[PDB]
Structure 1
Amino acid sequence: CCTVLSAFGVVILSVIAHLFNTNHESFVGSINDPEDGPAVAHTVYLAALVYLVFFVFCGFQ
């Protein structure tokens, strides 16, 4: 079941990292939201790569 969670971890976190990179107002637009967009995108995109490693490793099971 880790491959399903890992595929959603690729897709959802890649979309979230792209929405932090382009300064989308549903993620950056508030005062309580983080200030720097690509600084959060750089640490969400690496998590997308980590879940892609889990998806490739559990895809050969």
Structure 2
Amino acid sequence: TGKAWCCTVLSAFGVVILSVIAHLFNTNHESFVGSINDPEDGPAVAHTVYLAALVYLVFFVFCGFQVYL
């Protein structure tokens, strides 16, 4: 029902937005670590964003079985 579509679509794009974000701190993209206020260490961040992105893949598959039934 509607209570699962919320966490489904949210977790769906959440995986797709966070995965691209992690790939950019790793590669040291200018817009994300080029300035001084931005964090200095890239891969110290991408290791944190993979993990958080998995958490949304948990709720995408978990509530993905519930809407199926």
Structure number with higher helix proportion: 2
How many residues are matched?
Answer: 61
* Structure 1 residue 58 displacement after superposition: 1.2
Q: Which of the residues 52, 58, 61 maps onto 2:63? A: 58
RMSD of aligned C-alpha atoms? 0.7
Residue equivalent to 1:31: 36
* Structure 1 gaps, min length 5: none
- 1: distance between equivalents of 2:64 and 2:35? 39
Cα deviation per residue 1:10-43 (whole Å; 9 max; x = unaligned)?
Answer: 0000000001111111111110000000001000
Whose radius of gyration is greater, 1 or 2? Answer: 2
Identical residues among aligned pairs (%): 100
Q: Where has structure 1 moved over 4 Å in runs of 4 or more?
A: none
* Structure 2 gaps, min length 5: 1-5
TM-score, normalising length from structure 1? 0.94
TM-score, normalising length from structure 2? 0.84
- 1: distance between equivalents of 2:27 and 2:53? 17
